[PDB]
Design an enzyme around this catalytic site. Sequence first.
Site, PDB file in Angstrom:
ATOM      1  N   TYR A  82      -8.854   7.009  -2.225  1.00 53.70           N
ATOM      2  CA  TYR A  82      -7.452   7.367  -2.040  1.00 53.70           C
ATOM      3  C   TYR A  82      -6.837   7.915  -3.323  1.00 53.70           C
ATOM      4  CZ  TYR A  82      -8.473   4.809   2.140  1.00 53.70           C
ATOM      5  OH  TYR A  82      -9.042   4.398   3.320  1.00 53.70           O
ATOM      6  N   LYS A 122      -0.997  -7.057 -11.545  1.00 50.20           N
ATOM      7  CA  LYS A 122       0.017  -6.473 -10.668  1.00 50.20           C
ATOM      8  C   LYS A 122       1.352  -6.339 -11.387  1.00 50.20           C
ATOM      9  CE  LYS A 122      -0.103  -7.345  -6.239  1.00 50.20           C
ATOM     10  NZ  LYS A 122      -0.263  -5.980  -5.670  1.00 50.20           N
ATOM     11  N   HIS A 133      -3.763  17.350  10.149  1.00 50.20           N
ATOM     12  CA  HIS A 133      -4.657  16.628   9.247  1.00 50.20           C
ATOM     13  C   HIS A 133      -6.048  16.464   9.863  1.00 50.20           C
ATOM     14  CE1 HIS A 133      -6.295  13.017   7.262  1.00 50.20           C
ATOM     15  NE2 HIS A 133      -5.486  13.263   6.249  1.00 50.20           N
ATOM     16  N   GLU A 134      -6.103  16.051  11.130  1.00 48.10           N
ATOM     17  CA  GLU A 134      -7.391  15.823  11.774  1.00 48.10           C
ATOM     18  C   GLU A 134      -8.082  17.138  12.103  1.00 48.10           C
ATOM     19  OE1 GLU A 134      -8.799  12.890  11.983  1.00 48.10           O
ATOM     20  OE2 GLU A 134      -7.100  11.583  11.548  1.00 48.10           O
ATOM     21  N   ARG A 188       0.820  -1.208   0.000  1.00 54.59           N
ATOM     22  CA  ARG A 188       0.000   0.000   0.000  1.00 54.59           C
ATOM     23  C   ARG A 188       0.855   1.260   0.000  1.00 54.59           C
ATOM     24  NH1 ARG A 188      -5.187   1.955   1.806  1.00 54.59           N
ATOM     25  NH2 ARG A 188      -4.942   3.971   2.858  1.00 54.59           N
ATOM     26  N   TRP A 233      -5.110 -11.464 -11.515  1.00 60.43           N
ATOM     27  CA  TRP A 233      -4.712 -10.468 -10.511  1.00 60.43           C
ATOM     28  C   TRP A 233      -3.215 -10.223 -10.503  1.00 60.43           C
ATOM     29  CZ3 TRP A 233      -2.554 -10.312  -5.300  1.00 60.43           C
ATOM     30  CH2 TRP A 233      -2.823  -9.108  -4.639  1.00 60.43           C
ATOM     31  N   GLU A 236     -11.012  13.659   2.740  1.00 56.41           N
ATOM     32  CA  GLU A 236      -9.625  13.339   3.039  1.00 56.41           C
ATOM     33  C   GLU A 236      -8.658  14.345   2.425  1.00 56.41           C
ATOM     34  OE1 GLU A 236      -8.933  10.529   4.874  1.00 56.41           O
ATOM     35  OE2 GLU A 236     -10.961   9.693   4.932  1.00 56.41           O
ATOM     36  N   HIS A 295      -6.166   4.869  17.370  1.00 58.85           N
ATOM     37  CA  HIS A 295      -6.199   5.420  16.020  1.00 58.85           C
ATOM     38  C   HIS A 295      -6.718   6.855  16.034  1.00 58.85           C
ATOM     39  CE1 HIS A 295      -7.636   6.043  11.867  1.00 58.85           C
ATOM     40  NE2 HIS A 295      -6.667   5.208  11.537  1.00 58.85           N
ATOM     41  N   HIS A 333      -9.805  18.003   9.084  1.00 60.78           N
ATOM     42  CA  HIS A 333     -11.065  17.260   9.027  1.00 60.78           C
ATOM     43  C   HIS A 333     -12.137  17.967   9.848  1.00 60.78           C
ATOM     44  CE1 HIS A 333     -10.280  13.734   6.705  1.00 60.78           C
ATOM     45  NE2 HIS A 333      -9.414  13.189   7.538  1.00 60.78           N
ATOM     46  N   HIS A 337      -9.481  -2.592   3.948  1.00 63.65           N
ATOM     47  CA  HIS A 337     -10.595  -1.940   3.261  1.00 63.65           C
ATOM     48  C   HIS A 337     -11.429  -2.923   2.450  1.00 63.65           C
ATOM     49  CE1 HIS A 337      -7.482   1.124   3.990  1.00 63.65           C
ATOM     50  NE2 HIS A 337      -8.506   1.928   4.216  1.00 63.65           N
TER      51      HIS A 337
END
EC number: 3.4.17.23
Lengths: 201, 596
Positions: B497, B463, B356-357, B255, B459, B384, B327, B360, B487
């Site tokens: 994202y 990739k 960042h928050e 990720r 898949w 986001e 979190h 938000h 997710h």
Amino acid sequence: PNITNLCPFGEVFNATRFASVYAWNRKRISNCVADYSVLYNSASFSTFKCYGVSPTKLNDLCFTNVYADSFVIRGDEVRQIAPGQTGNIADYNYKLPDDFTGCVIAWNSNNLDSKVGGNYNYLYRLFRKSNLKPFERDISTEIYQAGSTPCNGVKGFNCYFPLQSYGFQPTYGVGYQPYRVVVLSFELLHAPATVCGPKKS
Amino acid sequence: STIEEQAKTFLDKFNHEAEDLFYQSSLASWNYNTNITEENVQNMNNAGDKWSAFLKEQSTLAQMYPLQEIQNLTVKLQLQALQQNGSSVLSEDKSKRLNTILNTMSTIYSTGKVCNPDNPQECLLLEPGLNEIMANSLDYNERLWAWESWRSEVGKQLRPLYEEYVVLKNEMARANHYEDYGDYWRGDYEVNGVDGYDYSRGQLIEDVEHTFEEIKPLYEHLHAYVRAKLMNAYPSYISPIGCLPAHLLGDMWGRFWTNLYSLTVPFGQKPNIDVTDAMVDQAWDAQRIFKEAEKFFVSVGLPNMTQGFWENSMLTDPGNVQKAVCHPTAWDLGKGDFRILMCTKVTMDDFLTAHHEMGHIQYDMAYAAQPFLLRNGANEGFHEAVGEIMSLSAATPKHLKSIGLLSPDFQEDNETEINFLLKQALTIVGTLPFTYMLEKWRWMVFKGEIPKDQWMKKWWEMKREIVGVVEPVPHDETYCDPASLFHVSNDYSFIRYYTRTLYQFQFQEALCQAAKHEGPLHKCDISNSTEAGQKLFNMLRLGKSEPWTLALENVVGAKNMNVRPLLNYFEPLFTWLKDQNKNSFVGWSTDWSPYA
Ligand SMILES: *[C@@H]1O[C@H](CO)[C@@H](O)[C@H](O)[C@H]1NC(C)=O
Ligand SMILES: *[C@@H]1O[C@H](CO)[C@@H](O)[C@H](O)[C@H]1NC(C)=O
Ligand SMILES: *[C@@H]1O[C@H](CO)[C@@H](O)[C@H](O)[C@H]1NC(C)=O
Ligand SMILES: *[C@@H]1O[C@H](CO)[C@@H](O)[C@H](O)[C@H]1NC(C)=O
Ligand SMILES: *[C@@H]1O[C@H](CO)[C@@H](O)[C@H](O)[C@H]1NC(C)=O
Ligand SMILES: *[C@@H]1O[C@H](CO)[C@@H](O)[C@H](O)[C@H]1NC(C)=O
Ligand SMILES: *[C@@H]1O[C@H](CO)[C@@H](O)[C@H](O)[C@H]1NC(C)=O
């Protein structure tokens, strides 16, 4: 001379419980001495907006009767208690005339009127067929008909209950916290004016 | 009287009772998160059941008002949001089966514990330990063991469950007048009824491919550089002509590439921009971190935090006796109540997370004037993106020097900018092919383009083709390698994202042009600029009332997502990577040349 028999401002401002905005309490104040400088010089009030008269000369003038209307609204709804405004409170709960002489006093009451579970004792009228006239009280609990179908007393489709509670909780924002509002209405009629200010000796 | 007035009164009653019930549910969730106790779990479950039952009843009652007889756009938007059946259109047996499948996938992912065969006396969970092993180990076979063992256990458990999940979700989506569940997810970006600003569900895939085609050269150069550095770290495993081995990317799934910064640093000799020691020396409390963030938001012209924010937020870990989720989460509880739940440490990452928050929180505060069902972002990307722009602006050396956290005599030369941009690329650029490949694979699975017997053969082929990452050993159809991620296993959309990443740099270019910044884009700070805050707040105040295309017009002046601000952001790094890749070969081969 020596002045006694003060007006009962203790039973309006310092009341243990206030009425809802819909069934707003009206107290007629007559035949006493009204000291308005005690109210104006208090630091406990957030809004003291006077319409049609200035607070400085209130302590001098004399009026026939004083109407003290007391209720509780939200923080964001204090602006609607004014002449010429609009909103749920002005249209459906408490309407002030455009030619209004008096003062609108509001203060935060999050300490008293909010509980952690939610205080549902304060209500507001959310619907009505027409807007209220100035100084009108509607305490009817008849089911609002928004549609063609008759309600028949049951809150089904398109038929809702007019009065809705404000679930006042202490952790609310300042625009949602409960505010106690006292509106003083001053009128002069041809009768002898008896609510006068205090006179210096 | 008319249908539109009936819908307006119904929306008013809905809004009023919904706001209160959502508050009760959100407060129960907050009390569970700051205090993990069984009665709090019971209270959360009761409040959530009441909220869900209330949404079911209002969805049942909202459908009786036909959409085509309403002309006001906001009323039609709220009625469209409320009239979605969700899972209610599906039969009770299949709905119960779907809920059971979702809950058991959540339990399997959350409580999945894997350790080495022949040493089973204690085992490690993914979030406490396997993350740290993937992020910090330098051993090839240890990472290979962890990767293969976790995909073996999790995939072999989740493969029949996912096979049932795709069929049930497709059945629900086609019952809801969608082509597939992928179309249901793409329906978040659908704008209908606005002249010129209409956006279609089918346009999203074309726009994503069109943007990724421009992403691809920068990612190819970054991939070549990371391949060369990983070849230096691991001498024989990585081929010069082939793809990267899957278990060496620094994270469990690939990720983010941010855990390869130590191995792939351009200029190790030069110092870093770490400001942790400076806050430790000046004794910066978490309260000071949030106050500095508030100072940043008042500098740009946004409103400051409420008194209830400071009173009711938990910005420090409570202690041993009281348990809380670590979190970082920003909570819009309703009724003007805004809180941040973060176990804030004295680190740069926590400081940027605080910015960042609080971004938000600012986004949540801005649309508080809107009706309850329109209190969201215009799409899932904006919410986001507005936090990520604050994370971008706060990390700049100008912001650190301005607030005193960085030395005023710190030399900003090109080498530090190159290595900082490489770190930002490993975090930001590296997630884009993985995100696009994952969403395209899920869309093809929902659409029926890939049969169940060919899920993995396609898949890995995707990739290798897109991400340039090769499997260590071939996997058959008994594995379920995608669903090892949080997710996908827990029914979350993943294109947010990708859209967030592009919207982040589009917003950054718009605000930096507003703030009259005269240098490189990555050196830009939006503090002290009232006009930049006003341009941001014009979009922020709208919420979900307006189409996301119109909101994007309000900020950047474009009606569509654009890829040029991201490429402009990494242009010094792009030139440096092109210079560094003269001897090496950019691009990869899909053959089994490194390992299979
Ligand atoms: C109401 O209570 C306050 C608080 O002690 C007091 O100062 C005030 O005199 C009381 N009366 C009025 C009319 O405000
Ligand atoms: C957390 O829950 C415990 C349960 O016994 C309670 O005693 C305590 O007061 C709670 N703490 C807070 C801060 O709510
Ligand atoms: C739609 O309704 C809102 C109130 O819900 C109103 O403020 C707005 O002006 C209306 N728009 C149109 C175009 O009628
Ligand atoms: C929701 O399901 C009901 C049940 O068939 C259906 O009548 C209604 O049209 C559905 N609503 C939407 C928006 O598809
Ligand atoms: C936010 O700013 C206003 C005006 O600058 C100030 O009066 C208020 O006290 C501030 N809020 C807090 C919580 O300090
Ligand atoms: C940085 O600038 C100096 C002088 O302009 C130059 O010699 C050097 O190659 C540059 N390095 C990079 C990575 O751009
Ligand atoms: C923003 O304004 C404050 C107040 O004058 C100032 O101290 C700060 O240095 C300014 N920021 C920058 C980057 O100059």
